Amino acid sequence: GSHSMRYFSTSVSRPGRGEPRFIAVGYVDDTQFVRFDSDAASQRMEPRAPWIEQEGPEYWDEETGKVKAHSQTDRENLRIALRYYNQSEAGSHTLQMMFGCDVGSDGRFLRGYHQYAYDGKDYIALKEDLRSWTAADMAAQITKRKWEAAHVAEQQRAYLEGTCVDGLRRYLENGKETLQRTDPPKTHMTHHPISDHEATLRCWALGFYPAEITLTWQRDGEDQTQDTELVETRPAGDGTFQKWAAVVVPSGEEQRYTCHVQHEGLPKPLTLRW
């Protein structure tokens, strides 16, 4: 199937307590592989996946340089965003950044990304055509005019269709063993009475990768939102993922209910019944 590479960076200001905390991480698909933390001692881009340790010193030196500089840029943007928004120097703000590309099965470029959020809200983003920007509001509009002047979009477009996708394909190769594995969910059902008239049915998916999965309940061959609970997909910690879904069900009507599991590691979609 497809793949993605993502970099995420977060800056949180803390006035009185010194410099913004900065943390960057990078993923290939759902597997994390680098991190940088402004508050840690190394002050280095650090490896977080086995198949990235094999990069030469020149690689670690440059990635550190880029990400240190980026933290100063977002340090700067924090100050600027205070001014654009006319906010006091007393409080605390977050600036988040996201950058990356998706490729297809052939390894060819599918899509590029580059966006910002301030205080958890959309700020500016590169549109799908990687030619123009979307600015959430009046403040981001100023930045939008700037980046249009500076031809930022065209730089970033060339990076995304080039370097991004080349690094991505190179990483997918370096970690073949691991990143192209496709673990199907192992499934089972559990059952608990809640009263004399009702019971809970819980439908479990375990040990799958990648995280993308769909669990859906049917009554008598029809979807059901009503009386369902569905938790966020969660990491097991060993590199696999977990999820479940549950319905509260009248007693002795268990057999009408079915849980449908979908996942790309699965030849046919699965159906569980109690």
């Binding site: 990635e63 840029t73 943007n77 600027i80 654009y84 930022v152 730089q155 991004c164």
Partner: peptide, 10 residues
């Protein structure tokens, strides 16, 4: 490889 973000001034 982390992006090149020098001209990402607000």
């Amino acid at each position: 490889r982390f992006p090149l973000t020098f001209g990402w001034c607000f």
